[PDB]
Amino acid sequence: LRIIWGTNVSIQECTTNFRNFLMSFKYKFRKILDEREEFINNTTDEELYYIKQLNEMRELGTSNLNLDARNLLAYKQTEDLYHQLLNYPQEVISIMDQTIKDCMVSLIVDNNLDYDLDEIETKFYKVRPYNVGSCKGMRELNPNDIDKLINLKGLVLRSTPVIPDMKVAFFKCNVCDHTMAVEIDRGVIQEPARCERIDCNEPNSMSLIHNRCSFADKQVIKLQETPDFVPDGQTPHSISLCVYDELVDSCRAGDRIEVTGTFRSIPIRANSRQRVLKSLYKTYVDVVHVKKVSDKRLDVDTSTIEQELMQNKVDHNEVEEVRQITDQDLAKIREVAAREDLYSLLARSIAPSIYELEDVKKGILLQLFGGTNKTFTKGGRYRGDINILLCGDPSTSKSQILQYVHKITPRGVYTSGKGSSAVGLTAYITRDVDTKQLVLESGALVLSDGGVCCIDEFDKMSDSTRSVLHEVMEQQTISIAKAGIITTLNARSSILASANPIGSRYNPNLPVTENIDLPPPLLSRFDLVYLVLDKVDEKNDRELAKHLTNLYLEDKPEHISQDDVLPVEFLTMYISYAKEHIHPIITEAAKTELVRAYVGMRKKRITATTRQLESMIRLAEAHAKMKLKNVVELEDVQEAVRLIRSAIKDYATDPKTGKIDMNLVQTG
Amino acid sequence: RLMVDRKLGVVKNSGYCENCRVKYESLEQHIVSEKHLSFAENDLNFEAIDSLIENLR
Amino acid sequence: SFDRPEIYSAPVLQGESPNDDDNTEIIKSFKNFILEFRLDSQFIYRDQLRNNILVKNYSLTVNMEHLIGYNEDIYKKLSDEPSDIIPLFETAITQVAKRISILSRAQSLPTFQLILNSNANQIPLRDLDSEHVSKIVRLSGIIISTSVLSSRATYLSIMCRNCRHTTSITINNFNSITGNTVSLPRSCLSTNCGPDPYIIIHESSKFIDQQFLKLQEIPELVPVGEMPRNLTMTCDRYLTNKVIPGTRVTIVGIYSIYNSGGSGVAIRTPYIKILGIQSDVETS
Amino acid sequence: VKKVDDVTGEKVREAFEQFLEDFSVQSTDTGEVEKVYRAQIEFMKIYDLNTIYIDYQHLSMRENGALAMAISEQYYRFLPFLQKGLRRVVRKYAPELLNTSTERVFQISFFNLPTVHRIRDIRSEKIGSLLSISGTVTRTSEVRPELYKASFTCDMCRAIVDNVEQSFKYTEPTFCPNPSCENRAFWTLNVTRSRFLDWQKVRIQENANEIPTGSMPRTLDVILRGDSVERAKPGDRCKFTGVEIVVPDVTQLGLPGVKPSSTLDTRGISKTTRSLGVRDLTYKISFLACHVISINERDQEVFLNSLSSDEINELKEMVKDEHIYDKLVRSIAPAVFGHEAVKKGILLQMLGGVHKSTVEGIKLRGDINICVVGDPSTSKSQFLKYVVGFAPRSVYTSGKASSAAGLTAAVVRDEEGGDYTIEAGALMLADNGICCIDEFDKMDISDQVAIHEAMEQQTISIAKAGIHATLNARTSILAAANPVGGRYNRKLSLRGNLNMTAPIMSRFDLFFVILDDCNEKIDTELASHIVDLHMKRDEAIEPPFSAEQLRRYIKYARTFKPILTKEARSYLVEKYKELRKDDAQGFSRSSYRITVRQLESMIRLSEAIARANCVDEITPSFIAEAYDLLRQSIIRV
Amino acid sequence: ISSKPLSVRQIKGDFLGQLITVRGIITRVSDVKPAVEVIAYTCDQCGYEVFQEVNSRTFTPLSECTSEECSQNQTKGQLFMSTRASKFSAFQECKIQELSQQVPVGHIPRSLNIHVNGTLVRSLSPGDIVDVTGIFLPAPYTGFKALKAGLLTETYLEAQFVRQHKKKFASFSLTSDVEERVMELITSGDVYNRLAKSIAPEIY
Ligand SMILES: Nc1ncnc2c1ncn2[C@@H]1O[C@H](COP(=O)(O)OP(=O)(O)OP(O)(O)=S)[C@@H](O)[C@H]1O
Ligand SMILES: Nc1ncnc2c1ncn2[C@@H]1O[C@H](COP(=O)(O)OP(=O)(O)OP(O)(O)=S)[C@@H](O)[C@H]1O
Ligand SMILES: Nc1ncnc2c1ncn2[C@@H]1O[C@H](COP(=O)(O)OP(=O)(O)OP(O)(O)=S)[C@@H](O)[C@H]1O
Ligand SMILES: [Mg+2]
Ligand SMILES: [Mg+2]
Ligand SMILES: [Zn+2]
Ligand SMILES: [Zn+2]
Ligand SMILES: [Zn+2]
Ligand SMILES: [Zn+2]
Ligand SMILES: [Zn+2]
């Protein structure tokens, strides 16, 4: 009996149901739940899932269990526990923490394990439900949804410094120096009105010692909603998330995160002088789980968060920054990398629904892989970010290729050229409405750090806006010296720009540089300049028309209209593994081929600067990273040179004058 | 402190099961449950008793 | 142009352990004493309260020895802090009387007065030291003066002068004091109007009777060459016009203090708040 | 009343006393047992110092680490006990140091902590504990007096209660000295009869290498107290050791969450039948530093005196070298290949001339300003990259990412309703250093005029918002620019190639125009260097001098005052004549024409060359070298 | 009387307190926020739930319990807010504006504040031309204090019903009357040409 007032939750029944779920859950239950019974493999989907998780947490010393809420729907006894957890997260999560402690104690005692029970008993175990029902955006939540477990998805814009939240107030007597330690209770600390010592009973002798109190970490994070459903006429919304005591600093600006937390409302005092609250409550989210890994997205660049990864180890936050690759997945990755057509398979796996553009999708793949990041022991840095420009005739799917690389990249901001400003692409000063203070917010090029910034309409953006991209495309930094901000900000973001030539058509009469219409200093920064031309070829029309019209045969198309394309789930994992674990090293034969080719190109018309040698190297490295090779041979350099030449269509360009021979184009 | 009776809001065999480590409200549904059947069908769990069945015989 | 927001409560949970000294525990124990006390298999106090309600006698007469026989600790509380415990007993009587009256009307009343008497040992009027102050004392004597009844406000409506803010001041306790402990507010209470802006609406106010008696030690047991010692007493409501001068009485009261026996420093004038008068056989 | 004693506080004080007395160190083959801290106490006795430097490495060994835990973890609690122990040790050994020469205030300055924290590694578990952080100083307060031991006069009893310890906030006493008054709430602070400390509030940003991906730099307010004031100046990267404290922060109003609050306990209070006493317990994390070290030299002898002997060995060997100029040039920007004139110019800029003031105060400046222009991808920004990170007090910035208020000082306001302050600009964080401005052409005209105001007078005047300060910006400007159209026009003048305004262009001593050509051998060799620089990391870089000893040599050579001998004056005149004759010839068509500004450029370049050769006399060969370096900079049209 | 459409100008102070319909165009809609109506507190001493009604823009929270037990006792209990037990309302503050056909000659259209509460929220969006029926109610003055001459009151419309002149395509439901009309359109034949020629029929 004895349910909790205001809730359906009964401590005994909920504890029993959650314990039964923990002891007797296998992932085949969820596979049956998701109507995926033919994916059920007896080897790993028939082991108790949470028993193994509890054992791993006991062995590793961690304290946080990541509970998939939908799993509770798979189990019959916890079909109601799912609704209780969603409706009453506080009570249910407290009961779940207690149940986790009991479960681990039972695992140690009942199996008679050697593990000490002292440090288990004194440890506080926490549960992190994440995969709760995903719907209703954030603006469609009514006041009846207050104090409910909700799931938001969005982009991190800003994060306040670590705020101390007092948990224990330390008072001291001004007379006898006797101290009590009051505990906070629902945000209220009972200040003593008399010294509890029987010797002296001075009324106002007690004074709060701020620096000797006990404090905990609190952080407010500014998030932009990116809901699955967007009602007509509304604009993007910003909300404030609250992370507590282990989740502080786990989210950086520019991160795309799915956050599960309690939808809370607080009354805001109208003035700082009097105690009067406003009748209109302010809504926010108490974060209980953060998911920074998407199964259809590349992993974050580990070379940019090494300090953050190891700070995450000290913080014991247990936030999964990069997805887990199992032994079977690693074997599959190696088997696919051992294929003879690996390059063409990965190229056509990039945006399967865009028509054949083999070099554009091969350059995109190499940019996704990137070069090798070389840090100098004596001071210096080379970044393997590859900048690609897609200049071409209108209607060539340049924008669909930028939209895929924006969706597939871990971090990055999609800009439109004329809608961007020099200040907008870098750090700027804004005003917070909560604190009424002046704060710094990142720009598009800073939020894209560690990812790819997609810039559409690269020709339409002005000369002064384009000035900030020079330092990013060359040094991968932004050295800002403005009123209030004087520092160097890492901007290690590849630049994927799209543009059409002047007149909105590639006139063959004018040379390449006249059509592109970009200053030598910016056209050199692009590692791969693609000329995407819309030639009238009858078979090309025949096949592009079948491709486009096949997408309309079924209401929601499942695209398998190729020999074979890897799923984005496998493609992203392969690319992330290659980026993380493969660091190609240039060999001497590769060096000779590189020097050979650079001198060959170094012999109006588009120039060939020293930056082209540096695009070769990194491009070659990208190729060497694609095949999981730790060294670069001359084949990779030859492929990089061939890609560079074919991107600008040198096979149809007269060496003397930069005319494109329309009859020599190889659309195919 | 917040507990109130279930009159507000929301097969006599019941008890613990040392095999499955789960509490059941009904014996005839625990023995036919998934985990109990899996435990019973696994002869590795009943190994030391297997010494006795034929040690006496 | 909106109305007054209301404030209301409802019991949901057990709070902190009922503590014995809590005014609400004391009221509950007095209510249980009134409803459950039996003398010769008779609920004497319940029947007395009902009969008093029928005859429109809004008071209850209680023997303190019966209270000793029921609960000794709260008898200690009543006899040691009468000024703080007597209103609780009156509240208990009022609650029980409301229940009885409403249940009996089918085949409002003010706060009931506790007229408590006893037959315990009596302190002589010359034996009252300063240790009896603010305590229940039984003392015998003879009444030598009974003043005219004076009107004391038990519930008065007030209205601000430079406003029309209507308020009500209720005096259910502390009616026995030479001064007036509760006065009109010094501010408009509607939060400038000025100091003491309230006036009393006399046609909607309620008043009670008060009388000043003068007890004296009996002249038989007096020192030959000294003045007989007298003592001022104050009674209210149903304890007024009960005795006439010359009546030999037994007064149960609170030995209290008021400030007014001539040349002295920090000295005070003692008096008796009468809680019960026990007249003897006197002249008919 | 029996005052409650902190038993572990007394124990920590006793442990600190034995640490101060009995600690011994083994010298490196130069003596027997020496007591470090007794020697330090007698040292600060003789020199009347107030700060004692305690090494945490030394402290960790004592009490099997039990003194170490307690001091590092509960520093705010055990600090008074450490002060008492130090005072007792001074009272028994060297007892004359306890007086000001009322009472001497003692500063215990811990340093050499095992680990250094970042600004973003600061967490609320470590409040009131000893720890070390690092950060780049942006703003420093004027030293201000902070009430340390206040004196109070009571309105009833006009006596004087003194030594009222102000721990962290204004605190009136509780009991009067005279027993009759019995007053606690009414007091007056009399300022003369009070005692004060020195307080500076430093603002520190995160280091550029510590900012995470996509995040913005974090700022912290460090509080320097005692003798550590003015030890940090804007621009320097300093590490601080001290207490992580909390200060009231009323700006947390409106923030999400349940902000803590305090209410007076209303039980056991004896009501008779509105006393709120409600406060806001919102705080922000600040830092209180007891030790600052950075991570006036114009005199040569004082610089050589405080410098290790082996470094003297190598410095004098470098001076004894014959081609020291050529080796220095080859050691400048080793990653760049083949631009040797630019390396010469950078070395001379990093050395500099002498500042000379006339009788009436013309104040001739001896800072070499260099502009590097040329074709795309010619290593122009790889020389600016090299200068920042090697040259001390060097600030790198870009044209489009800078403003007039970011290069010169700005007038900013942290809090609405708060006063205004001067946060130091790029031209001041690089004071007595180099400001490397990349993409000078991209910069706006107004920003160029602002930089012009600093190139003419080496000073910046800001008269905005009620602050009328005149700041000095003694900086050399190394600028990188791109010609209009994105490519240098050989048949056009240097002025026609550059959109840079003439008032700016005049103050640049050297204009290095770098052009690339399709030379077979040069391209084969640049490409070998780029790929070897990619294959190897530092083995491909083979400089004659490492950055350490090169920086040491430059630091030594900056201490000279070069003088030119009598024949040098006449040859300077002759070389100026030769430059004027070369210009306006009729067919030379120089990129920029010659005037008396070139003659001043030549003098300061000769002084820089003399500093490079480490001689106080400017040989006429130095004037010849400066003349050649200047003349080769001009490009014929 | 309550349904004849009124302009923003035609809604004078005589109509205050009445149920009236205003015809206009919505120009600004705020986010649906929880506006507290009866804030609830729990007392740990007596175990009571004390409810305080909220009527104005701002309210002062209770500090000491006001239940029977604590009021009768001398040791009062300090009572904490209970958000889940409090009464909240989905609150929106829309702004309606005069249509161009309602503004007099040479005048600038004036706006009116609409207070949408309960399940009626999210029924008004900017750009909607709507007939909003609600109770015209007064509010405490919010202008400059020096300009207050008497008991001046701000006004708003407590929305009760919304009629959309142009029904949104997303809110379409195939009810019976919608069905009969569509069949009477289809059975007439030539739907494509009839619909095309019916678009601006005076354009030829
Ligand atoms: N090769 C292609 N593969 C797939 N869809 C294509 C292709 N070419 C054109 N399309 C389709 O036709 C449209 C044109 O593609 P877009 O992405 O608009 O081209 P674009 O190159 O961005 O055009 P500009 O240069 O910006 S006018 C899209 O809606 C595509 O679905
Ligand atoms: N009103 C002013 N007039 C002139 N210089 C000023 C003025 N205000 C600030 N400054 C400059 O700013 C420097 C910083 O010193 P302060 O202004 O005293 O400190 P601050 O950085 O404003 O710190 P706090 O927070 O006010 S203690 C001064 O040394 C001046 O150079
Ligand atoms: N002489 C050289 N020595 C070493 N690296 C060189 C040389 N010339 C060119 N490079 C390389 O070519 C690239 C030049 O990039 P930057 O140094 O930014 O050139 P830049 O002259 O600033 O170009 P702009 O003016 O910004 S288009 C880098 O990869 C350099 O390492
Ligand atoms: Mg497009
Ligand atoms: Mg450059
Ligand atoms: Zn005390
Ligand atoms: Zn079982
Ligand atoms: Zn009034
Ligand atoms: Zn005093
Ligand atoms: Zn209460």
Numbering used by the authors:
A (entry chain D): 177 to 779, 789 to 853
B (entry chain 9): 529 to 538, 655 to 701
C (entry chain 5): 2 to 108, 131 to 214, 235 to 303, 317 to 340
D (entry chain F): 100 to 200, 259 to 430, 441 to 462, 497 to 838
E (entry chain G): 220 to 423
Task: Copy text from the publication.
In order to limit ATP-hydrolysis dependent structural changes, we used ATPγS, a slowly hydrolysable analogue form of ATP. 3D classification of the MD-(ATPγS) data revealed three different structural states (state I-III) of the complex. Out of the three MD complexes, state III was resolved to the highest mean resolution of 3.1 Å, with DDK having a local resolution of 3.5 Å. We observed ATPγS in four Mcm subunit interfaces, with ADP present at the Mcm5/3 and Mcm3/7 interfaces. Within the active site, we detected ATPγS, a Mg2+ ion and a short peptide fragment positioned within the substrate-binding region. The fragment is located closest to the most N-terminal resolved region of Mcm4 and the Cdc7 active site is directed towards Mcm4, away from Mcm2 and Mcm6, suggesting that the peptide belongs to the flexible N-terminal tail of Mcm4. The peptide amino acid sequence was not resolved, but contains a bulky side chain at the P + 1 site, consistent with the DDK preference of an acidic or phosphorylated residue in that position. To our surprise, in the MD-(ATPγS) structure we observed an ATPγS molecule bound to the Oligonucleotide/Oligosaccharide-Binding (OB)-fold interface of Mcm2/6, a non-canonical nucleotide-binding site. Specifically, the MD ATPγS structure revealed that docking of DDK via the Mcm2-HBRCT-Dbf4 interaction surface on hexamer 1 directs Cdc7 kinase activity to Mcm4 of hexamer 2. The MD-(ATPγS) structure can readily explain how Cdc7 can reach the Mcm4 N-terminal extension and phosphorylate it, as the Mcm tail is in direct proximity to the kinase.
